[PDB]
From a paper:
[name] ([name]-(N(1)G37) methyltransferase) is an essential [name] modification enzyme in bacteria that prevents +1 errors in the reading frame during protein translation and represents an attractive potential target for the development of new antibiotics. [name] belongs to a distinct class of S-adenosyl-l-methionine (SAM)-dependent methyltransferases known as the SpoU-[name] (SPOUT) RNA methyltransferase superfamily or Class IV methyltransferases. Each non-crystallographic 2-fold symmetry-related protomer of [name] interacts in an antiparallel manner and consists of two domains: a larger N-terminal domain spanning residues 1–161 and a smaller C-terminal helical domain (177–242) connected by a flexible inter-domain linker. The SAM binding region of [name] is located at the base of the N-terminal domain and consists of a deep trefoil knot architecture, made of three distinct untwisted loop regions.
Structure-guided elaboration of the merged compound AW1 (Kd 0.11 mM, LE 0.36, IC50 0.23 mM) was performed, initially utilizing the indole nitrogen as a vector for growth. The methylene linker attached to the indole nitrogen of AW2 allowed the added pyridyl ring to occupy the region defined by Pro85, Glu112, Val137, Arg154 and Glu180.
Author numbering:
A (entry chain B): 0 to 16, 28 to 45, 47 to 158, 177 to 232
B (entry chain A): 0 to 160, 177 to 227
The structure:
């Protein structure tokens, strides 16, 4: 059993969500001011940084000492399939979705004193916020909840379509020849598309 | 000006993007995002999108017949076809920059064990096709991958929306026993830049040693 809490300033983005309960929290519910979640960065620079004070009160109410705090960030550790397996057995996940240029560092540092904190990246691209990354994390984790190489090409009926035939080995019904072909196709694809997985230089 | 078409069996998954778009960008004709149900192009009364894999195996493969019809109607010869897949080329920031100047993007969102390979192969004979992965993890479909692709591409299109970045700080100067690093309040902007560069290198060594 697992509980996932997602904290964000845009709770509407998280709308695409027995054994698991998923709750979305608006961060602006923890502001006592009439107007603000963001302020200018110390030391200068572009954009805005999310204030630590608002995040502190939100995570104090939601998180326990057993909580694993997930902070999506482009500067984080790589979130992989290995990470997804490690997180699928967790009791409580809190995903802190940032916006603007990110969250004040002291939020992750403060939470690390009472709980386990993971700053993670889902890929080498920049998103506008952690909301999209949260949806990626949730999907990757939840499909592994109890209850190595690139995948080869997949085919289904008809056997001939638009003048393109399904590879005749798959129709033959020879399990040993099918497995040998599929392994060949997977290894040829991994060389071409992701040579790093087999231990070669990226293009 | 950019048109994005998304084809999926779950069109409700792509509600975040359409909601997150500002009205000013749509009214100026900079962006038009349209979501299409794949079951519009089904042939049978049961509205079948999937069928059993050739050569055995677990799970199901999405039908080439239904997908072929959908792409014939939506795609032109100037279309760049984006097909999210765990076995694809890596989608990076460089990939996002290249696609930000494109006129027509069609994202084909698969489910089950993926789409019949002949769909992309047929499309490759008359248009540019990109099979892409957003990371080294497996999702249930291409819908979450599409939201990632759309957000990354569109934020680089103006008005629509290397080492690792160091720690960022804001008000207050003191919070829960932690002070903002005094260098950031010194007024020595040469020293700040050098401090930020060192923090960037330290974070890169610790978190992403592959980039060095
Ligand atoms: N793998 C990832 C993670 C992210 C991500 C996660 C959370 C936030 C909150 C804000 N931004 C924007 C932003 C812009 C400039 C520098 C830092 N951050 C985020 C981006 N994108 N791609
Ligand atoms: N970087 C990526 C891409 C995907 C992705 C994209 C599209 C589909 C359509 C179906 N599945 C599930 C599935 C499971 C087992 C083998 C093949 N596919 C998808 C997964 N996940 N992570």
């Amino acid at each position: 059993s697992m509980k996932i809490d997602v904290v964000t300033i845009f709770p509407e983005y998280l709308q695409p969500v027995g054994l698991v309960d998923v709750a979305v929290h608006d961060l602006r519910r923890w502001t006592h001011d009439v107007h603000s979640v963001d302020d200018s960065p110390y030391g200068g620079g572009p954009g805005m940084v999310m204030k630590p004070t608002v995040w502190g009160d939100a995570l104090d109410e939601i998180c326990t000492s057993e909580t694993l705090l997930v902070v999506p960030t482009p500067a984080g550790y790589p979130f992989t399939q290995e990470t997804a397996w490690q997180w699928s057995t967790e009791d409580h996940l809190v995903i802190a979705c940032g916006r603007y240029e990110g969250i004040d560092q002291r939020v992750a540092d403060d939470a690390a004193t009472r709980m386990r904190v993971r700053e993670v990246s889902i890929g080498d691209y920049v998103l506008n916020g952690g909301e999209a990354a949260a949806l990626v994390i949730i999907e990757a984790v939840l499909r592994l909840v109890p209850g190595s190489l690139l995948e080869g090409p997949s085919y289904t009926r008809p056997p001939s379509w638009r003048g393109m035939d399904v590879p005749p080995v798959l129709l033959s019904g020879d399990h040993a020849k099918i497995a040998a072909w599929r392994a060949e196709q997977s290894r040829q694809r991994t060389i071409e598309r992701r040579p790093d997985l087999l231990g070669f230089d990226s293009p």
